[PDB]
Amino acid sequence: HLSLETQEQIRQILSQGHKITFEHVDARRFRTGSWQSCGTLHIDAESDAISTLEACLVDYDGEYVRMVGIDPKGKRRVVETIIQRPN
Ligand code: NI
Numbered sequence: 001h002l003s004l005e006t007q008e009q010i011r012q013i014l015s016q017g018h019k020i021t022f023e024h025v026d027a028r029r030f031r032t033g034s035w036q037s038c039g040t041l042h043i044d045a046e047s048d049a050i051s052t053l054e055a056c057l058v059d060y061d062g063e064y065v066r067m068v069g070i071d072p073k074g075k076r077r078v079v080e081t082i083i084q085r086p087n
Helices: 004-015 046-059
Strands: 019-025 036-043 064-071 076-084
Touching: 004 019, 004 046, 004 064, 004 076, 019 046, 036 046, 046 064, 046 076
Parallel strands: none
Antiparallel strands: 019 036, 019 064, 064 076
16 A cells, blocks of 8 residues: 555656665664665566565565665666665
8 A cells, every 4th residue: 555655756766767676674684774675676667666566565574665766877876765664
């Protein structure tokens, strides 16, 4: 049940011609910033982003999940936004 805001953030990234990678981390590895990707890297379509995020939320329920907007030129990380925290 993605919020309006989460979806707007997805659109904001894609509208820049940037690509989305979702990442997850458990509380222990959150301590050291040791995130890992979930799903396909460098998503370029909202449908794919929503599908992937919903999958990541289920698959890593209990972890942090965040969205990373990436400039395709040089794979520069532009923005990171936490979507879910541990429960
Ligand atoms: Ni839901």
